[PDB]
């Protein structure tokens, strides 16, 4: 029941104890482990509201005090009235870090505390929606020294009039099939890409073309906006050693922004609450290049190098796997946008993992997801035990919107 | 129940039915995913459902399932149970179980070879020196001068826990490792502890950064003996790059008889507590993990110093490219020495036809994601893309403690 952590490359062990406040679901059984797997009322809402009122207020030193028996009242009382209830600032801003302190499969944890929440709650509009976003956009970009921050829509009240970005991310590139059958941009969005159209976007048919924004509020249809281009902050990719490297006439957006998820806080469910916080190197050189159902680009890259590309044993895909993510990492360095590489980033995260043990007792963790796309054992985290349970305030999946939307 | 599993690189899903056999325990809850966690004297009482469960399981296979050999047989080890409070396989049965064993690692990403098992019966075997010739010809057979085959070593199973047969050694074959005054390891980091055991035991140590180890040996019980291995039985291959002449002078060189004995076999409730298997390398073994794991030989600075990388930012990624450098000297090395190894491109591709092979055909694969994934490259290789469902089936191979913990000394 008190749960032993060790790390084979140090031997330090720690022991678990924040596991026994777990209350979703893992997946998992005896019998069966699926930690592999991608995706494994007003009488629900009180314990909910009261387990999370309870953990805020004995983060703030006040547990089994009138102010929280106050609130823990107030709260009772207008679920009793309202069926829902509403969040104090306060309670948003906390609930918020805490989804973020809770999410297992993010490795960028350490800087959990520091986050900046736009309470968008006031908001009714898609337009509404936009203004709020380009602000986000701009705030958390910075001129490129990027700072972490969540904007938070109305929360769902009887999902009929749900908020919703459609958008899986807030910047992303097309995807568009060809006649050839082959694909022109990013394949993962290709589909969202029709949407788009079906909506009335008029692709560039390009490579590289920033998808414009699906935002729906209020249960209403969604709508179109183009971000403002001078607040996409671009970059473009070369080598410091490869020249040819900028004729492969790649780039990225610097600003990793997920809009699809949804934020759970003492049972209230926030279904558009975009975050971002900056890139970790792999995510673009590794899964976003790479990936055969991605951008692919290993053999064009491998062929430039001129490889003997005739047997897997030459290891030619490792080779131009780390050329590849060299330069992403030099390219980002060198327009000042901020970036991370794996190495400091899960050297961060064992630093995170101790203070977590330590400060609360442990720290939820997916070795599956933590564990970077490349070079594995050469980083700490590989050597390092994980206990993976589910923590709430959460960040969870929702369906697309596009399955559910009743026109 | 129906288990889906999905391909996110090629769409492909399977339904796993096989898992529903499963009866062991995996260490997970609803409540808590063990996955990355490392590690998570029988009565006639538990013993016969075993021998029955195995038994109707070999006997399918056969498809000779309810015949009277099949009964028979049910009746003949019930017997024998209740008269002698265990039992012995036959060598059909025996040979069917290590087979099954190696088909039921979740945590090997080889098993596409699991039916070609050459299985050496050793239950004849009565005395350290008795164990010292078979373990030798095991090595012999199964290094056939670089063209690797597949082997298993069974000596006799538990009878009391009091006259365990064991192989003190984790490897056949395996570098020693020396503590120095100074706080600094000569050799392989992982082995000082038995190298000690061994130097008490009356091993006389070279000292050097590659002694091949002693066999420490234990038979029925007793304390265990040392031998060593002829060293012309030993394959050892001089790691060096196809394009790097300086890397000769690192002075590597490694073994090439991945050959683990500190595993148990279980086959049927019975314990097999001696039951040395080898096969091949796969590159990153000894490539990422024996040279360039932190506690092990740790040689990616020299290396990156000699190439002449940006060591003073990690940004340079100046430790991939030394490892992927490393990683193609050792494939070379073994490829130019006509010793048997294999890329992690082959072997994970290899991997994901036998896993959707044995779906089809079997129901399931069961598989650890967190193991099989190579550790270097990860999602390059299609393992990394490939939803698994991990769970135990019997016949199994598993952990056992440490002799040297357990031991009682005789003197
Ligand atoms: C600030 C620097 C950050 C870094 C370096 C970072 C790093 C990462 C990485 C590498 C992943 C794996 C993503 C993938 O492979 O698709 C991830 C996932 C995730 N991150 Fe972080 N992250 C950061 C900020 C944040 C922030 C600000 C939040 C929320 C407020 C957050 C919440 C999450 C969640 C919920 C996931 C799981 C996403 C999913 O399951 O699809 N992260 N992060
Ligand atoms: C023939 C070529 C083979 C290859 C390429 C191969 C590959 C591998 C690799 C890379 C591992 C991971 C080990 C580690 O990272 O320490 C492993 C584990 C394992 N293999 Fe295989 N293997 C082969 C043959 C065999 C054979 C013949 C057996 C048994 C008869 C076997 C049974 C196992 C078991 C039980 C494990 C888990 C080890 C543990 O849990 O400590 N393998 N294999
Ligand atoms: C805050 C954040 C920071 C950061 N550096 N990177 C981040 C990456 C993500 C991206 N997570 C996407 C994970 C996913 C989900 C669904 C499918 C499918 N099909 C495939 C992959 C989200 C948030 C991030
Ligand atoms: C048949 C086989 C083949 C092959 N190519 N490689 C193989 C490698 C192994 C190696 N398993 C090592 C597992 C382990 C467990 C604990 C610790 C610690 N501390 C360190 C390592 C076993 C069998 C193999
Ligand atoms: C099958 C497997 O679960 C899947 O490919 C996972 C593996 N680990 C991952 N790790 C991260 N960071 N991101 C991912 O999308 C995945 N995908
Ligand atoms: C903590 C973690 O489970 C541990 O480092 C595991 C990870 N995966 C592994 N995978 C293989 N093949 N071999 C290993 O030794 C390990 N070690
Ligand atoms: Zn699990």
């Given at each position: 029941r008190f749960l032993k952590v060790k790390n084979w490359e140090t031997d330090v062990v720690l022991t678990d104890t924040l596991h026994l406040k777990s209350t979703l679901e893992t997946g998992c059984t005896e019998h069966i482990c699926m930690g592999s797997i991608m995706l494994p009322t007003k009488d629900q809402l009180f314990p909910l509201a009261k387990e999370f009122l309870d953990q805020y207020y004995s983060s703030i030193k006040r547990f089994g005090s009138k102010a929280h028996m106050d609130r823990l009242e107030e709260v009772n009382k207008e679920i009793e009235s309202t069926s829902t209830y509403q969040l104090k600032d306060t309670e948003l801003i906390y609930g918020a870090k805490h989804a973020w302190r809770n999410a297992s499969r993010c490795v960028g944890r350490i800087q959990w505390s520091k986050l900046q929440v736009f309470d968008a709650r006031d908001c009714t509009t898609a337009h509404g929606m936009f203004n709020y976003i380009c602000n986000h956009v701009k705030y958390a970009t910075n001129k490129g020294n990027l700072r972490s921050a969540i904007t938070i829509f109305p929360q769902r009240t009887d999902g009929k009039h749900d908020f919703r970005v459609w958008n899986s991310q807030l910047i992303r590139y097309a995807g568009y099939?060809?006649?050839?059958?082959?694909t022109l941009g990013d394949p993962?969005?290709?589909?969202?890409?029709?949407?788009?159209?079906?909506?009335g976007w008029k692709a560039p048919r390009g490579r590289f073309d920033v998808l414009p924004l699906l935002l729906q509020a209020n249960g209403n249809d969604p709508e179109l906006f183009q971000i403002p281009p001078e607040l996409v902050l671009e970059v473009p990719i070369r080598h410091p050693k490869f020249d040819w490297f900028k004729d492969?006439?790649?780039?990225?957006?610097?600003?990793?922004?997920?809009?699809?998820?949804?934020?759970?806080?003492?049972?209230?469910?926030?279904?558009?609450?975009?975050?971002?916080?900056?890139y970790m190197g792999t995510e673009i050189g590794v899964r976003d290049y790479c990936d055969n159902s991605r951008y692919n680009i290993l053999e064009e890259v491998a062929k430039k190098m001129d490889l003997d590309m005739r047997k897997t044993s030459s290891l030619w895909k490792d080779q131009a796997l780390v050329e590849?993510?060299?330069?992403?990492?030099y390219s980002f360095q060198s327009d000042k946008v901020t970036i991370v590489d794996h190495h400091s980033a899960t050297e961060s995260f064992i630093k995170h993992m101790e203070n977590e043990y330590r400060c609360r007792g442990g720290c939820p963790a997916d070795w599956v997801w933590i564990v970077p796309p490349m070079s594995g054992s050469i980083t700490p985290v590989f050597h390092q035990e994980m206990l993976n349970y589910r923590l709430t305030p959460s960040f969870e999946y929702q369906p697309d919107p596009w399955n559910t939307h009743v026109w």
């Amino acid at each position: 029941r008190f749960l032993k952590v060790k790390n084979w490359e140090t031997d330090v062990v720690l022991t678990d104890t924040l596991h026994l406040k777990s209350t979703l679901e893992t997946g998992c059984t005896e019998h069966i482990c699926m930690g592999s797997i991608m995706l494994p009322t007003k009488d629900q809402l009180f314990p909910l509201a009261k387990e999370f009122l309870d953990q805020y207020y004995s983060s703030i030193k006040r547990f089994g005090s009138k102010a929280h028996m106050d609130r823990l009242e107030e709260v009772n009382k207008e679920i009793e009235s309202t069926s829902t209830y509403q969040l104090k600032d306060t309670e948003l801003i906390y609930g918020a870090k805490h989804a973020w302190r809770n999410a297992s499969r993010c490795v960028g944890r350490i800087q959990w505390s520091k986050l900046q929440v736009f309470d968008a709650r006031d908001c009714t509009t898609a337009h509404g929606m936009f203004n709020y976003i380009c602000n986000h956009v701009k705030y958390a970009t910075n001129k490129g020294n990027l700072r972490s921050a969540i904007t938070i829509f109305p929360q769902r009240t009887d999902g009929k009039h749900d908020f919703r970005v459609w958008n899986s991310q807030l910047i992303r590139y097309a995807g568009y099939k060809q006649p050839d059958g082959s694909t022109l941009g990013d394949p993962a969005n290709v589909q969202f890409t029709e949407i788009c159209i079906q909506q009335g976007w008029k692709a560039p048919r390009g490579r590289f073309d920033v998808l414009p924004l699906l935002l729906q509020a209020n249960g209403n249809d969604p709508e179109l906006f183009q971000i403002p281009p001078e607040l996409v902050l671009e970059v473009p990719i070369r080598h410091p050693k490869f020249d040819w490297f900028k004729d492969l006439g790649l780039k990225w957006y610097g600003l990793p922004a997920v809009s699809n998820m949804l934020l759970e806080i003492g049972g209230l469910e926030f279904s558009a609450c975009p975050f971002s916080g900056w890139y970790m190197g792999t995510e673009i050189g590794v899964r976003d290049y790479c990936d055969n159902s991605r951008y692919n680009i290993l053999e064009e890259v491998a062929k430039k190098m001129d490889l003997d590309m005739r047997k897997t044993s030459s290891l030619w895909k490792d080779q131009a796997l780390v050329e590849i993510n060299i330069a992403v990492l030099y390219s980002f360095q060198s327009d000042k946008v901020t970036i991370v590489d794996h190495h400091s980033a899960t050297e961060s995260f064992i630093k995170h993992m101790e203070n977590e043990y330590r400060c609360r007792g442990g720290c939820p963790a997916d070795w599956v997801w933590i564990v970077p796309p490349m070079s594995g054992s050469i980083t700490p985290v590989f050597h390092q035990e994980m206990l993976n349970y589910r923590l709430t305030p959460s960040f969870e999946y929702q369906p697309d919107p596009w399955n559910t939307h009743v026109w």
